Each structure stands twice: as structure tokens, then as C-alpha cells.
Ligand binder design. Structure first.
Ligand SMILES: [Fe+2]
Length: 194
């Protein structure tokens, strides 16, 4: 495993964040950092790539000391899908293997959510951005019904601890905390094992 590439990404993102950019500058300059990471699929620990039959898995890879960001391996078993939901922090999503569909939503005056633009297909190597400022609400699904798809997510917080919400088609808001699938993180720092 090329865990040095993951270490490099974490270091460089933290370096960008050290210059205290606004969200727009951050998303713009971190976009190529993550695309470079997901351009080649040779680093993700198999532990953090494992699908589950009932639900997709969320494997935490790294959290910044000051929680300025977290890096999560998002794993879709065949045909799995999220409900419509928000994030409340900035996010960058890089596709690793397989593919996923992403449909942005927006609310009318009465609460009800509607698709607010074209559904997007994210191919391996591609990166998309989200945040409360530029659009925070979407529904995501595995683009395939016959395979496992994986995307790497970077959020502007410890996303598993962020209190957010899911929305029904009728617009019912329900409190949501995603948590994480792994009770143990991969050790990506023991260089003497490389
Ligand atoms: Fe999401």
C-alpha cells in the first residue's frame, strides 16, 4: 500500500489550511490535492474498503488535531443509496473506484425538497465540492447495482460527530449523526513497515 500518498495529502491539506484561506479558496486549492490522491487506487487499506450487505460503510481514515478536517472512506455495496441529507460543513468528495450518482436538492418555502439541478455521475479520479454556502443538500447512490463503489471524503470537521439531518420527500426533518463503521483507525504512520 502507498500510504505515503495518503500521508502526503493529509500534510498538504493541513498546510493549505494553515494559510487560513476562505472556504472558496480552500475548496478550489484542495480540489487538486484530493484528485491526485484518488487518481490512483493503490493506497486504501482493505479493511477500509469492505462493503456491508445492509448499509454502506463509513471508515474514518484520519482526523486533524484541531478537527479542521476529517478523511473518510465511503463504501457502497451494490445498489446502496443515502436518503436526502445535509452536511453543515465544507466537503470534497473524490471518487476512488466504481461510480456514484449525486443529485443536489433545494427546499421550497414550505419545507419540501426538490432536485435543484442535473444529477451528476462521478467517475474515478473526479472530485466534487459541497458546503452550506454553495449547496449542502443532496442524495447519493452507487451508480452500479452489480459492484462495490468507493469514494474518499474530506469534511471540514469530525463529520461522524456533526449533528445534521435527513429529509423526507414531504420535507420532514430528522436529526442525524452518522458515526463511523470502524472502532479502530488504520495505522498509516509506521514507516518501518514499508
Ligand atoms: Fe453526503
Amino acid at each position: 500500500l502507498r500510504l505515503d500518498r495518503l500521508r502526503q495529502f493529509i500534510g498538504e491539506l493541513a498546510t493549505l489550511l494553515d494559510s487560513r484561506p476562505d472556504e472558496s479558496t480552500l475548496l478550489a486549492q484542495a480540489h487538486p490535492l484530493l484528485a491526485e490522491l484518488v487518481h490512483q487506487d493503490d493506497w486504501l487499506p482493505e479493511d477500509c474498503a469492505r462493503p456491508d450487505p445492509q448499509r454502506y460503510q463509513q471508515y474514518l481514515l484520519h482526523v486533524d488535531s484541531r478537527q479542521r478536517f476529517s478523511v473518510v472512506s465511503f463504501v457502497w455495496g451494490p445498489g446502496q443509496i443515502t436518503p436526502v441529507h445535509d452536511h453543515r460543513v465544507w466537503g470534497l468528495i473524490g471518487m476512488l473506484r466504481g461510480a456514484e450518482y449525486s443529485q443536489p436538492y433545494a427546499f421550497d418555502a414550505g419545507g419540501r425538497p426538490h432536485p435543484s439541478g442535473a444529477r451528476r455521475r462521478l467517475e474515478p479520479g473526479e472530485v466534487e465540492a459541497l458546503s452550506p454556502r454553495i449547496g449542502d443538500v443532496h442524495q447519493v447512490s452507487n451508480a452500479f447495482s452489480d459492484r462495490t463503489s468507493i469514494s474518499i471524503h474530506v469534511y471540514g470537521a469530525n463529520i461522524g460527530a456533526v449533528r445534521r439531518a435527513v429529509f423526507s420527500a414531504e420535507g420532514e426533518e430528522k436529526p442525524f449523526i452518522s458515526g463511523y463503521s470502524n472502532s479502530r483507525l488504520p495505522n498509516i504512520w509506521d514507516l518501518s513497515k514499508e
